[PDB]
Every structure is written in structure tokens, then in C-alpha cells.
Design an enzyme around this catalytic site. Sequence first.
Site, mmCIF file in Angstrom:
data_model
loop_
_atom_site.group_PDB
_atom_site.id
_atom_site.type_symbol
_atom_site.label_atom_id
_atom_site.label_comp_id
_atom_site.label_asym_id
_atom_site.label_seq_id
_atom_site.Cartn_x
_atom_site.Cartn_y
_atom_site.Cartn_z
ATOM 1 N N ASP C 50 -16.736 -3.030 0.795
ATOM 2 C CA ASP C 50 -16.302 -3.395 2.137
ATOM 3 C C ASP C 50 -16.372 -4.910 2.295
ATOM 4 O O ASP C 50 -17.439 -5.509 2.127
ATOM 5 C CB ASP C 50 -17.169 -2.698 3.183
ATOM 6 C CG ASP C 50 -16.676 -2.922 4.603
ATOM 7 O OD1 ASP C 50 -15.612 -3.550 4.784
ATOM 8 O OD2 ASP C 50 -17.358 -2.464 5.545
ATOM 9 N N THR C 84 -10.057 -1.538 1.919
ATOM 10 C CA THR C 84 -9.723 -1.858 0.534
ATOM 11 C C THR C 84 -8.273 -2.313 0.413
ATOM 12 O O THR C 84 -7.977 -3.318 -0.245
ATOM 13 C CB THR C 84 -9.988 -0.645 -0.360
ATOM 14 O OG1 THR C 84 -11.378 -0.300 -0.302
ATOM 15 C CG2 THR C 84 -9.606 -0.945 -1.798
#
Lengths: 515, 508, 480, 525
Positions: C50, C84
Site C-alpha cells: 500500500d 496497486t
Amino acid sequence: DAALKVNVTSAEGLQSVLETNLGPKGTLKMLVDGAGNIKLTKDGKVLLTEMQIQSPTAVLIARAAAAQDEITGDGTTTVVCLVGELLRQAHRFIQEGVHPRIITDGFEIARKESMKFLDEFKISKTNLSNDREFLLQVARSSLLTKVDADLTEVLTPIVTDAVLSVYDAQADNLDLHMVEIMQMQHLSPKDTTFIKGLVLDHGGRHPDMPTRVKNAYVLILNVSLEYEYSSADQRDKLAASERKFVDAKLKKIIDLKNEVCGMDPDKGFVIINQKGIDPMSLDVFAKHNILALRRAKRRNMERLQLVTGGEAQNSVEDLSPQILGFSGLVYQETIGEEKFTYVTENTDPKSCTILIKGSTHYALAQTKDAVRDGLRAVANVLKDKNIIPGAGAFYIALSRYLRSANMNKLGAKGKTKTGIEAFAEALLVIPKTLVKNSGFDPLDVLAMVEDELDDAQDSDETRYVGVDLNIGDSCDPTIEGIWDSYRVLRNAITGATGIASNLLLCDELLRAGRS
Amino acid sequence: AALKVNVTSAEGLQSVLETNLGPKGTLKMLVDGAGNIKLTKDGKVLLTEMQIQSPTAVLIARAAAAQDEITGDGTTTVVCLVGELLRQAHRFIQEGVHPRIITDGFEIARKESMKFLDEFKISKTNLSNDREFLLQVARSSLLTKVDADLTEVLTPIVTDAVLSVYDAQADNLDLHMVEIMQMQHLSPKDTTFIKGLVLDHGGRHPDMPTRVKNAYVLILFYSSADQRDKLAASERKFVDAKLKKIIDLKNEVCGMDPDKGFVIINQKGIDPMSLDVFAKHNILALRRAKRRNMERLQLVTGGEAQNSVEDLSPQILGFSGLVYQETIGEEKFTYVTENTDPKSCTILIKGSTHYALAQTKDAVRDGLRAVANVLKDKNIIPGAGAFYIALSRYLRSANMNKLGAKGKTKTGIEAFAEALLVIPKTLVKNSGFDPLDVLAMVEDELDDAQDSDETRYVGVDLNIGDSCDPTIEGIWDSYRVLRNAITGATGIASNLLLCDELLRAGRS
Amino acid sequence: SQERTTGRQAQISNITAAKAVADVIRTCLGPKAMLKMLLDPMGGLVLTNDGHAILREIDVAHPAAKSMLELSRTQDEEVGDGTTTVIILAGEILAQCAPYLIEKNIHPVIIIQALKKALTDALEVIKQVSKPVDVENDAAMKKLIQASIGTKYVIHWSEKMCELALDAVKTVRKDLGQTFEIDIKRYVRVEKIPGGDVLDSRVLKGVLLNKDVVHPKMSRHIENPRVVLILQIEEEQVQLMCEQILAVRPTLVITEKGVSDLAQHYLLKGGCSVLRRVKKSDNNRIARVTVGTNCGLFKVEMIGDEYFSFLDNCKEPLSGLQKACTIMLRGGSKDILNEIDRNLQDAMAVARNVMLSPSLSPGGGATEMAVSVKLAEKAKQLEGIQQWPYQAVADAMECIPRTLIQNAGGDPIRLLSQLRAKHAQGNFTTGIDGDKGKIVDMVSYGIWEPEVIKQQSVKTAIESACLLLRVDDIVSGVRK
Amino acid sequence: DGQIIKSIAAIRELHQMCLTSMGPCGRNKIIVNHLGKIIITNDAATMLRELDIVHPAVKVLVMATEQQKIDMGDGTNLVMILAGELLNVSEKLISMGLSAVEIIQGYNMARKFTLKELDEMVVGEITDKNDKNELLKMIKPVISSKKYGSEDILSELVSEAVSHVLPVAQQAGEIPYFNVDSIRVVKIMGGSLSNSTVIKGMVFNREPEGHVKSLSEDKKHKVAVFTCPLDIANTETKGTVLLHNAQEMLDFSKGEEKQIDAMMKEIADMGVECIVAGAGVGELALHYLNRYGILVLKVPSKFELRRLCRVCGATPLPRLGAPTPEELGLVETVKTMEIGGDRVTVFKQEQGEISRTSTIILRGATQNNLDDIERAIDDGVAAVKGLMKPSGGKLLPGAGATEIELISRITKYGERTPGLLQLAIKQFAVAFEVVPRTLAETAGLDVNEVLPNLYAAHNVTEPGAVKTDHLYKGVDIDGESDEGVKDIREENIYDMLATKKFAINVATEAATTVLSIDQIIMAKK
């Protein structure tokens, strides 16, 4: 053995030095010192000279290249590459508890077995027929490992036609027969032109010197030509006697020149001295149509005997017609502050002169290092008629026989097998470096080569499979024309085994001396 | 650019626990600033207080947290796998392999390891409560921690301790038997097991009963100076009201004849006058007695734990078969034996010095937990690195069986097979033998077993450096030992392999 | 203090601020993306994919890169789905504005004019490649959650994990009858207790009260559990509350604290099961649905850690608004439970954006290639002064899939050359395969994303570059 | 070579120090702590206690030595030198290539073998229980470990101390455990060795209360020990005096006097001979106390009151009331006699009964020499403990003669154990050779003369004669140092079996712990 890994880790960083300089697709590394010399080349002898080193083990690496310069002189990067793979395998297998000499003894057995399979892999060729197709293909692979493709196409017929001048029925090749290379700054480096005759590096220093001549008569000198009271009347006689020593020799030159034929001074005549020239002699040389020089070299005079049968004379006592040669045509070119003389139309010249023109020093340093390294490599090809397929085909093929031995060559169980698997996989780093320098994946290319060798071996057919770095696929060294001399690969494997035993058999590092 | 930084620096972390693996291994001294000397092969202590250099050791130390609740012994395989994995990066990844290419081969091998895990295990019957199988498992379990002297003593102790905890459903909880006495007395080999409950306090008065059969356990502004003494007289009546009620309530069954045993246990301090008034009725009291240990008394005599002195019922007072008290040092111990149906046992450890107990305290806590997984799961896996060697050969030759991506996975397959071979080589290196000759003999035993059309499991004998049988030798591991370890073996590997770049920065 | 930069030094320092960070996040894109390691001031490390916590822990000496974290928080609060493939787009703009800025002496406002025109043509492309699908089918959202969870092995548990969130999705919805399917999923809290299996999670349509009843062996059935919004003190005071609710005769009891012994006499005489104290936030969950009535059934379960209570209305209306519920997540281990929370917690925003825009934009690098072609087509038509800057914007969207190719390590020129034909001309479903690194159909392979993912990102990303082109002078080191 | 080796050098510094501190010919040392504590003694056990411990094996040795002080405490440097000798032998075994595990196995298998060899050296099997005369003879050689200057005077002080505490009860009297803490020696500066006496009661140094302790010549008194100290009456929490008017201002001082009249007279109503007051009291107490002739104990310590209960034989009353006639102690004579220039209050009685917990007044010129005598009393009563709580400790030949026979026994065990045990067991007997060399080094004799004497006695052989002279002869130096042999039966120098029995387990434990250390790990230290 706490200091055993000290020399192993410090010497590991020596592989990345020449790693990028290996292969025809390799790149260049710049090394510049503080004296103003810019050397850009793939040769390791120059890069390892002025570069400061940390680990002392690099000194033995330079000593291993001493035997490679005489036998090969080009492609010496594989010497340190096989050591770098060994150093990565060093701390691997030695950590298992195997004594370092046991691995060293395994290399001696693998080296003897490599020479047995070495004669079967090579292809014997006939150098008497003077095959042009074979020479153009071998010289092409050598030029790509030094210079780019622009100079490769130009120097390919140059190197091919140069080695054809030196040969005989007894296979006598004299490396000192053709040596001298002409270093000039003219036009561009890609304009280098090959000459089958002889080239002189000096020309007339006076405007009245002959511009164009046909038959030249060369008079070679060595010893220095330049010469160095109750009343003032004696001072005038001593200064006037200084020119009597030179004028006495000038009177002999006038009569001995006109001896044979003095009617027409339309031919060439040249006087060559090592030291400075007396300005008083230029007055006699101008009216007599005599070419003179100032600060001329020496060794270049010995080449007149190998072509026209000239003679290099030292003193002024001996003067014979054997000293004076002959020439079919002479073309004198003026470049810079020193005129250049070309001797062409020779009857049967036995030595070729390499004329290299370029821009600046670093532009000439690339070609000068390539010709000397490329000519001596091809000269060794004609010495031994046995030719080994190149392009790393032997390193991969020999590993296949070493990986599978069992009841054939075994010896001790696990002591020798450790050295067998080590040396078999130590030769596979070379094709991985060739592809890495080209920018492709070495494993995907090697996987296709192993699959091609498995299909060729199971089909029961003799074939040599190489690696084409341009398209990134497999090829045949016979089709592409990549070949290698017998003495090059034999002394490379034997030389790599001797230098490998130096680092492996070092037990501990010791510091002793006066601080 | 910085990917090779974490690979080379963290490589030197394997030598930490490298020599702590195996029963023939050695020990490492760890001393903190508080003066606590812990000498053990256990990884929980060595990876906790020890200072670390490379930041990658944080995830390595936290990886043993899952092994503490499951295994706790042989945790060095976590570090030995990471060290070999990083050395494979200097070989396979140095060739230009992307770090995730070799990572995917390990995740596929994790499912293949679970498939071969059920074939290598051997099922046993735990319903019959066979002690012969428990004596062998506890034997080899203690060999990796203490010597054979403490092994022979603690083998029947741990075996008989887990038998007291059992039911028709085979319910064994580690939270049931917890308290373990730690004291320096006699020698470590003198450790004695008690089938009943052990109390850490005893009679402080010469008139207290030394040995009895039945024991009743009772668990617990003024204007002038003359007016100031009225408060001191009223505060004494507070504790007197607690003591005077005891004299009358203990008369319930028999208060006239003090020929039986009497017990009073209190958490806080008590009026010393109790010793005088209880001497007439021969009632025993304690000084600074614990609390949590009182909950176990309900499982023997059927008593009830009581807090205050107000509520006292005959149900609290139980009937004990025999009560013995031993005087050791300044603290007497009351032993409760001859119990009708004891539901728990108390582990009493005797030792000489502090470092002598550190080896035993680590062995008992790790020993009781390892046997717990044996009774819970009937599947028992042969130990002595027999699975690590076998699984390496199963995945070494696969080809059309399990392949996947051609050339990308096969590179990682050979790395996982050679990584598991470091553990048996570590066992031989710690013993002082040649791992090359020992492994060559082990590989021949597995080849002779498969070619004989018979299923056999061959172990490694570290004494003579030859092959042996884990079944005959007695080396055994629980199924949950390698279940969480191999599952965690992929997680600890994917940590550094999927790690990209570490930057030097922060808030000063 | 000054710290002021004028002339050419002002633009060079601000571009290189986020330029060095853009190369660090290149490994955060795609299912093959790496895992970044962080270094805090305390020496610890956090390993995650993240990018929200990555830019927060890393301290950049240049203040210009601090806005990118704030610009990242805006996309995380508005979308926060699949960072992502999303959040990396924040640094793909300034890196492509470098080639021509000072070299052509173009004033930044001239570039701003090209930035405003690029946003106009970008909004038409987002909804052009989108295609509608059935909004009432829950099977379409099952394969969508499975696309973002491919960073772990949870695909084996994806059957229970996807249905865990999707049961709450259809449970809430319904903030409006007509004009748009607004909802709020923040009322549904996911509790993570280590130990057990994921199948222990109980989720369905209704209000899940996570608490226990009076006694674990009490009757597990209630006819109509109507919901309504030391010893001596507890028995008297609590009785004045729970028993007082019985005036309207509900069969369900909700208290703040537990039930004492005295209250059990009058609570059990109603012929039903008595429920003791209920969690504080659970009262806000039923407050949305509903004195509440029309409760179908009650149920209570028993397991060691905590207990369960089932409350099923089954009819909200008699319109109405959204329902709230509760979710408990039981992982296999301690370290496994905390790492998988990123994919499951983001599953709320996965289906939330499906209700917003049922149309679906192509994923897996297909959206960035579609925009790059449309921007390259309108560049030669517009010409003018915008020719150079508006063409570089097309190359900015082209470098985004180049980052996905960087994970494979091949030559993007070979792939992008084929994508300029089979994608632009052929169909919008053409994209780059993540697993094999090839060109395959995105819809056939299963890679797709809702329109809100690309719409609320690219539109925010283009507007986020405004602060980068407005920089002139930097003043710091004084006060605030 | 940087851990298992260099760790021996840390102990080698302490090992050489223990060589000169062992035996009656050993050397003393001067110790200066970091807090200013000065200790001069020949025992290395107290040295390692106050010394800062850096190397981890140093703490291993002091804890193993502390285990001896709890059990035996006689010649603790014997096992310390033996453990230190194993490290010197370890450098020879490590150089041979023996693994650390097999070296421990050589010591472990020899440990159980040595414990079985202790039964062959048993002499003096039978011993008397309640007989003091035979006890005074066997305790005399125990002092020889410490300063041997006078062993007769130290035995006479123990004779009078045991005679009081000894329950006697000949034949079978169900004799309880003999309390070690009952006998307490008090160091008194000045006087010679013969000036020391023994107090049957508790010897205290303080000022008498009224004038001097007297009136106890007629005996027939009652003394009660009070656990609750007598102090000014107050509550638990800190209170404040609040007066409602000015009339209570004059009654505040009079109100406290009413408490003194009530409290001091009630406790003095029974006429207790000696009252135990743990706290301070006012000066008005002399009114009632001197009227009834009550002796006052002013501010004792915590540990001296626990020993007082066994002297006066009084019940430890938990609260302070009026003295109860039911629970009372029996005390006859309490006097105060001046010894070292100050009045010394003593509870010593004259016949009439025998109680427990006696005391000994130790008078000496050098206070530093009194520390070794104080530790000799602790080791002196420890010799009686071996013959008291156990069935018996018997005897074994001392002066290192027992370890000489073991050298031949360990040598025979090595010939029967081939393999790696050949180098371990043969060198294990070498570890027993440092014991006789230590006694010869401290005596100054040449090792070349002692070596054949050590080989002659127990090594050669044992003739068929009954009670051979080899067992009753040993190494002792008085005038016979030239010959090197002396009869230990005439001098009656013997050691208990429990001395070496506990030492063999420590020698292996000290070797197993140190030799198994791969590396030393220290975090922030």
C-alpha cells in the site's frame, strides 16, 4: 581459517572490471589519467596498468595475462571471468567442508579430460590453399570484439590481405617481419587504407626538396651529422673550420652520385640522418636535387632490405651501391609539419605496411590497439592448421560430457565429483556474459541452446551450435564463420587452471613488515 | 540498485543460530543488563533480548512467535532457510532472475510439500493412552535441550503428567496444568513428580500437624490521647471478629478432638494471635499464601474457593486421603497425595543454581507443549531430518509431474531442494563429522529403500555418523510441528524475496 | 531564513522532488508488483504494497513532494480501491513534463491552458470505453473482488471472503429510490480475532448484533424480536430499563449493562429469550433500519472466544433507507490475519463503486492505452501552441503501462507497438496480461474494473497536476 | 579459538589466585570493594562474592561455591581449583580435536564412577551421636583448612557452646535437627585467645537501664518475650491533635501521663524479670520499672529476637497485654559483667537447666584475623551437621591422600574404555594431580621430591596385609617435609564423605557449563 574468506571476498569485485568488455557486442570503458592520456579500449593490459587496485590478488591476475599476450593478445577477458565464477563457487563448496586442494585436484583431472575431447571438437583446415572465405570469417569475429562495425568492414580485407603476404611452404610465419604501423592524423579514422608496399615516415624539410620522383636512391646515416688565441685571426679560422668537416663529406656525395649516371638528375635521392642536419648542407642538396631530412628515426631503415634489398649504413666511411635502392613510383604527401613519402610499385615486396589515418590521439589509440591485437591473433591461426569452432561452442559442449560421467571418470566419491560439477558449471558463465553484454536474457537463450543440443544429440548427428548475439537466437559457428585457433583455447584452459590454483591454495593472509 | 544491499548484509544472520541446531549441538551464553543468565538452545530467548544489526532480523524474530505457541524447539530452521535463500540470490538471482520468478516456485512447492506431508506421516492410536510410545517421543524431545541425565528423570514425569488430563473426547488443554514450581534444592536430577496438588506454604508453628490424612481446607480527630486508644481498640476488633467466627464454625464436624488435619489459607496478612487460638484446636494457618493456586482444590476434594470469612459452608471443606508436608529451606511445602480422582498435577522442579534451572525451565515448558500436540493430533511425523532429505529428492526430479512455467519455475525448484539439505548438513557439522560423507550414505539408504519395493523411513545417527531408523531410535515429531513450520517457511522466504528497496531516511 | 528559488532553479528543484520518488514506486504496480520496505524513526519496518503508508513514513527534504501524499489521500478517501493499479498514477505526470519546460522557455500558464483542455477530452474517453452490465447480479461482483486479492493466496478462501463482503453490499444500498444507489458501508465494522477459520463468519441480510444472551443454553428462537432504541445497584437500576421497555410488549431486550438475578424473574415470564447488554455501535446499526417492529427471527450461537446474536428484520418497509450490519473476521494465524485485512476492507469500496456507475471500464493497462491514443488523435487536430504540451500528456498515459511491463523486465516497445493497432482499432478490451506479460483479452481473462475507478482517478490526477504548474517561489523557515 | 579458548584466560586469572589461597600454607589477600568494604581472608569464596563479575563463567563459579556454603563450606577452593584445572586440561583436549560433547561425556561418565569410588576409601564408619568428647576430636582437623595456629582453644569454645545447646537424651531420644543459626559468634576487639569465653544466653553490647542488671541471684523469675514493641500509643494513620477548648490544653500533657501510669503499671504488675522492648519509650517508665526491679532490653535488632525465643523459652506473644501466667518463660540469672572495658549484658545462666541458642564471645587482638575465625565457627558447626541430620558422614583420608588412590582408579577405567574416552579419562586423572601439587606449592617444597612420594603410597600396589600403611599415611609437613610422608592416623586428620561427594557433581557441572559455550552474547552491558 578466519582470514580465508578475506582474499576471496576482496578478489570477487575484479570480475565487473572487464565484464562489459567481453564479446563482439561488448561495450567500452573509459580510463583517463592525470598526464593527459585518454585511453578508451577493451584491452585489459592498459586498463590494469595505471588503475589503482585494493586487493593485492589483482597482481596475479595481471601476471596471468603475460602468457596470454604472447600466445593470444586478444580476448583475454575470459581469464578473469573464469576466476570470478570460481570465487562465487569458492565459498560455496569450501563451506561444505571440502579441502581447497581437493577441488584443485579435480581441476587437474578435468583439464586432462578437456584436452582429450579438445582434439575431437576442433576442425582441421588447410592453410596451403589460402582460403579467402575462411580468413574473412575469422577476422570478422576478431574485429567485432575490439572496434565497432564501421571499422570492422574496412579492416576485414585489410587483415585478410596482410597475413597472406607472410607465408611459405614450410609454414614459416615471422611476427617481426611485418610490424611497423603508420600513425598519422588525416581525415577520419574510418578512412584507413591498406598498402602492400613500404611507407616512409619522413619527407623533405625544405621547399626545394624534390616534390615527385620515380627511382629513389636512399642514403642512410646514423651518427650525428650536426657538428658542434694570440689574435682574432685564429677565431675566424676555427669558425671557418667547423664547416670543413661537413663540406668534406658533401664533396664525396656529389661525385659518387653522378658516378653511375650524372646526366639527368630527374630521379630521386634521399639522405637520412638520426640527429639534426647542418643547414650548410641544404645549399648543396638543393642544386643537386637531393632530398634531406631533420630528426629522422632509425628502426624504419631496416625495412628497405626486406623489399628492395636496401642497407642501413651507420658511419660515412662505407658507401656502396647496395645502400642505394630503387623504387617504381614515389608519391610524397605533405601532412602537417612533416612531409610523408610513399614507396609503391615494388617488384616483390615481402612485407606490407599498415597506413592508419585518423583525427586525434584517442581516435588513433582505438585502431592502433586493435591492429596489433588483431594481427597477432590471426597470425597464430596460420601457424597451426588445427582450428577450433568458436562462439563459446566448446565451453557448453564440454560441460555436457562433464555433467554425466559416472563409471567413465569418477575417482573418489564426492571429493572429485565436487570439482567435476564445479568446473562443468564454471565454463557456463562465459555464454551468460556474452548475452548480458548484448542486453538480452542469458538463461532464455541458454535454454534454447540446451534444447537444441538435446535434439541434435538424440538424433545422432554431429553439429556445432553457437549463440547469435545480434538476433538473440542460436546459430552454427560453421555457418556464421566464427572460429578459434588451437593454441588460443588450449593455453586459455591450461592457463586458467594454473592461475586458479593460486587463489584456492592460499590458506591465510598475513601482514608482516616494518610500518 | 539497492536490491543487493539487503541480500548481502542479511546473509550473515545464519551463523547466529547455526550451531544451536541438533541434540549434539552446543550452547550459547546470553547475559542481559539485569543479571539474568539464560543458557539454552531455545530460539525464543536468543532472538528476543539479543541486539540485532540488520533490520531484517525484526521479521525473523517475529516469525518465531507462531512457533512459540506450536513448536518452540528446533526454531533454528527459520534462520537456516533464510541464510541459504540469500546465498541462492548470489547465484540464481545474480544471473538476472527477477526476485518474483523464484518466489512463485516456492509457493507452488508449498502445496506440493503439503501433499507429500500426509504420505510421510505415521498415524498412532492415542485413545489407548500407550505409554511406550510416549516414553520414546519425550526421550528424543529432551535430547535437543538437556543431557541424558535429566532426560531419564523427566521422561516418566512428562509421560505421567499428560495422562492425568484426559477424557472420553480426548480433551487436553495446556491452560489446565500451568503452575510449575521453580526452586533451588538438592540437584537437578532429583526432580520428583507428584500426582496430586502441591502447596508452596506450610505450618509456621511447632504445634502444626506434620502429617495427617484428612485435611479441611478453609480458603480466605480525637480531643484527648485517651480517646486515640479507642480507635486502636476498635481496629483490633475487626480482625478479632474474623478469628472468633472461625473457632465456632470449625466445630461443625468435629471441634472437640483435634486428631485430624486442619487447613486455613489466606491471601493477605492475618493477626498473629491466630497461631495461639488455633494451637488448642490444632488448626493450621499460612502466611502470605497465593490465590490462583486455590482454584485447583475444587477438582480433588470437591471444595469451593472462598474469599471472605463471612460465608463458610461444609461444601468448602473436603475429604483428603493423605497429606504430607516437607520442610525445605525457609518455605515448607504441603503435598496432597492419595487423591480419589485428581484432575490435575503440579510440576515440582528441584535444582542447584539459577543457570541450572534455566536449562530445566526451558525444557519443561517446551516439553509439555510438544507432548500436547502428540495427544491432540494422532498423526506423528518421524524426525531426525528424514522429511527434509526425502522432500528434497521428491522435488529434485519432477519434469512432467510438476513443472509449471518452463525454466522460470525449475530454477526455483532446485533452490528449494538444495535449501532443505542444509539442515541435515548442519546436524553433522555440529557433531564434528564430514557432512559430505554422511549425506552420501543417507542418499544411498533412500535409494535402496525405494528400489526394494518397501516403504521405509531412514534417519541420521549423529553418534556414529551413519544412518538409523527414527522408529527404533525413538525420534518423533508431531504433525503440527512441520505443518506450521513449512507453511511459515514459505512466508519467511517471501519476505525478503518480495522485498524491493530499502531507503535510508527518517525523522530525527 | 530565505530558501527562495528564482529563475530556472525554481522549476528544476520542484520537478526532481517527485521525480526520484516516481522511480521508487515503479515496483508497486500490477499483480506482479514487489513489496516495499519502510524505515521509521524508531528503527522498525513495515512491509506492505500500500502506497499510502509508504509516502507517509518516508521523509522527503523537498516540500513539493509532500502534496503528493495529500493528493494521494484525496484519492484514498474518494476511492481507496485497488491502490496497486490506481495510486501510482499520481507520479506519472510530473515525470513526463520534464522534457520540455525550460528548454522551450514556455511559461507555465501556457502549459496550464493545455492542462485544462486535456481534462475536457479525457472525460469523454472514460465513458466511451465503458460498457453496462446487469447491476442486480451478485455473481459479477464475485469475480471483481478476486482480481484485487491476487497479491496473496487467499484465492482459495475467496469463495467465503467475497461472499462475506457482498452479503453486506446488497444489505445496505438504498439511500434513494431514484435520482443512484448511494450507500454507507462505514457502519459495518470488521472485527479481526486471531484463531479459527474464515467460515466462522456469519453474514446475511439484516442487522447482526455481535454480543451474547443471558445464558448460553437459553432458547435460540424468538417469535418477533421487536427492537427498541454492586449486586443491589445493578439489579434495581437495570430492571427499571429493560422491564420498562416491555410496556409495548417486545420480545427482545437491549440494555447497556448485563442482567442481574432479580431481573431474570420478570424478563423470562414473557415466553421468549432475553438478550443482555448490546454493543454500543450496534444501536446505531438498527437505528437506520427502524420502536421497531417486523423482526422475523432471533438466533444465538456459542463459541469460545465471543458469542453471536442473529436479528433478522426481513421487512424494512410497510419507502425506507439502508440497513447496517456487522462482520467478524477469523483468520488462520496472527500474522496472516493482519496482512489480509487490506484486501477485505477495500472490498467495501469495490462494490460501492459498482452501484455508482454500472458501466465497466477495461483494466489491466487497457484504460491508459485508450486515453493515450485519443489524446494523440486530438493533438494533430488542435495544433496551435498546445501541440507540444498536449502531445506529451498522451505520452504520460503511455508510460503507465510501461511500469507494468517493468515488472516483467522486457521491451515495452514490442508490446506498445502492437497495442496501437489491436486496441485502438480492434476494441477497448485489448490489454497487457499481468501473469504472462502478453497481449490477451482483458474481459476474457477476467481483468476489469468499475468506471468509478478510472473516472474518479484520472479526473483527480489531471486536476492534481495544477499545483505542480503553479509553483513560482518557495518560502519556508519562518512560522505558522 | 576466540571463545572456547579465550574464556579460559578469564578464569586463569582467578585460577592462579585460588592456588595460593588453598590449604593451611595458603596466602591471604586484601580486598577493597567499590563502596569501601575491606575484607582480608584466605578464602576465595568471599572474594568472588564482593568482586564485580564480568565474564559469565565467574558467576557460574561463585554460585557453585555458594551451594557448598549451604551444604558443606569446608575447603570450597578444592573444587574451584579442580574446576579450574579442567580448563587447563581443556586446552590440551581441544588441541587434540575432541568435541565439546565428548569431553563432557568423559567427565560425566567419570562423575558417576567417582561417586562409586568414594565407598572404597571409607574409613571411620561408626561415630557417636550425643558424645561430645569424640566430637571435639573430629572437629579439630576441620580447622586445619583455615588458620591452624590454635585448634585447642577454638575447640574449647565450641565445647561449652554445644554442651548448652545439646539436647543430650542418650540412646534414642528422637533428637531433632541441630540448629546452626543458634550458635552465634561475636567479634570483640582486644584480648588473647584464652581470654575468650562462652555465654549460655544472649551476649549483648549496650548500656544497662536503671543502674546494672542484678537481683537475679535468687533465680526463680519469669521472662516473657514481646513481639509487639512498646512505644507511644498512636493509630496506624498519622493523626492530628484537635482541642475543642483551652481546658483541654493543660489536660493534653496530663492525658499522656495517664497513659504512662496505665500502660507501664499494667505491664509491670506481674514483675517480669526482663522485658523485651523493640521500640523507644519515655523517661517516665523508670518510675514503675525501677520500683519492681524490671530489666529493660533497649532497641534490639530483627535477627537477635528470633534467637531470643529459644533462650528464655518464652511464648512470642503477638500483642502486648498484661503478662499472662499461663504462657511464661523460665529464666534464672541475668547479670552484666565488664569484659573489654564496657559493661556487657549477658543472659548466661548457671546450671539449673539446659536451653538452646548459646553464644560465644570472640576476643582477639587483630580484627582482621577475627574474620577468619568467624568463618571457622561457621565451618566448625558445619562439621557437626554432617554427623547430625544425616545418618552419618563417616570419614575419608585427608591431606589429598584420597585423590591419590583415585588417580590409579581413573587410570584403570581409561584402559577399559577405548576410543575418545582414552584421552578424556587419562587426562581426568591428571585433574586430580593438581590437589597434591597445590599443598606442596604452598608449603614451598620441590615438586621433584614430592612426585615419587605421591607415586609410592597409593600408586604402586596394596600389599595383602590387613590395614596397610598406605591408607593411613599421607602428605603432611611439620618436620618431615624432607621425607614427604606422614601418618594421618596419629594426627587424626580426616574429612567427611560429604565433602567430596558434593564436589564431584560441581566439577562436572562447572566443566559442562563452560565447555559448552559457543559464544558470549551481551546486549547493552
